[PDB]
Amino acid sequence: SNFGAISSVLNDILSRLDPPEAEVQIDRLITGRLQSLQTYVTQQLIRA
């Protein structure tokens, strides 16, 4: 999932953009993946 970023794979982000401006896309991807992980962990705890 892009989560509003230009790509769904971080390798493209590092290998295409300049370092100092790829942080925005990297941060958006990080936020999305972190939220997904949190939801999964909470669901697992309830089921456990």
Binding site: V9, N11, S15
Partner: protein
């Protein structure tokens, strides 16, 4: 092209790491990639020649430490989980 080792490859912009074994997956009459349930480039066709290389990611693994209480002794036993450690 070298195979059977953990290599960082580059196939016409396809960037990744793993072992590029030689596999007879299917015909691939005109397709190049090979996908799976996720957005995984499982199989790749060579750019110079035409062969079906199979990409497998490098070995994962967690490290655990068997140890008695530090009061008793100091020797430990390391455990690498899910690692066929014929290769450390």
């Amino acid at each position: 092209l070298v195979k059977n080792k953990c290599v960082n490859f580059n196939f016409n912009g396809l960037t990744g790491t793993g072992v590029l074994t030689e596999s007879n997956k299917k015909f691939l009459p005109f397709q190049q990639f090979g996908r799976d349930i996720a957005d995984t480039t499982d199989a790749v066709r060579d750019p110079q020649t035409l062969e079906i290389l199979d990409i497998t990611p490098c070995s994962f693994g967690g490290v655990s430490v068997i140890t008695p209480g530090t009061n008793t002794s100091n020797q430990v036993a390391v455990l690498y989980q899910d690692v066929n450690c014929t290769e450390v």
